[PDB]
């Protein structure tokens, strides 16, 4: 699981850029995940924990701005590896909501 290949090929949508404070807070949270938190995040956003042939960079993950600050949880579409992330007010709020999402969600 190379989450650095995943970050290198990640696109951003809805106003997010690689410079967005939220996106940098995001990658700080994701790179610091435990191996199980990493497998959960991948299960949540791509539908599987096992990396593809070619590596995590093949996912071409998209992180799309899901509107302004809210307590609404992040959502995903696994047929596109799209993660809808609302612009959260903090980083610990982003970590808390994101972790609750990938731990409590199962199904489509």
């Amino acid at each position: 699981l190379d989450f650095q290949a995943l970050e290198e090929t990640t696109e951003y949508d809805g106003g997010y850029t690689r410079d967005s404070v939220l996106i940098r807070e995001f990658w700080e949270i994701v790179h610091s995940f435990t191996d199980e938190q990493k497998r959960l995040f991948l299960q949540f956003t791509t539908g599987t924990d096992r990396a593809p042939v070619g590596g995590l960079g093949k996912l071409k993950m998209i992180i799309a701005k899901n509107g302004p600050d809210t307590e609404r949880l992040p959502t995903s579409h696994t047929c596109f590896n799209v993660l809808l992330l609302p612009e959260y007010s903090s980083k610990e709020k982003l970590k808390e909501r994101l972790l609750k999402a990938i731990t409590y969600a199962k199904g489509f």
């Binding site: 609404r72 949880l73 995903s76 596109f80 909501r97 731990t103 409590y104």
Partner: protein, 76 residues
């Protein structure tokens, strides 16, 4: 009365409710305790999804009945 809402983490959310409480009120209490909006919640009791507009009594949910919370998030 007390009811329990089990998450996939195994965590149990204990709610103080009345039998005349609607399913909307139960989602509101879960929202107050967890932050999850009601439209991102799906509540399961006895294999049935709980529908708004009905009371816990209509589902014969009793004291210390256990419901299951699954979150509608990863619709892919």
């Amino acid at each position: 009365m007390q009811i329990f809402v089990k998450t996939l983490t195994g965590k149990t959310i204990t709610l103080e409710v009345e039998p005349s409480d609607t399913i909307e009120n139960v989602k509101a209490k879960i929202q107050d305790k967890e932050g999850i909006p009601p439209d991102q919640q799906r509540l399961i009791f006895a294999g049935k999804q709980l529908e708004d507009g009905r009371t816990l009594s209509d589902y014969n949910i009793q004291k210390e009945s256990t419901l299951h919370l699954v979150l509608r998030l990863r619709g892919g």
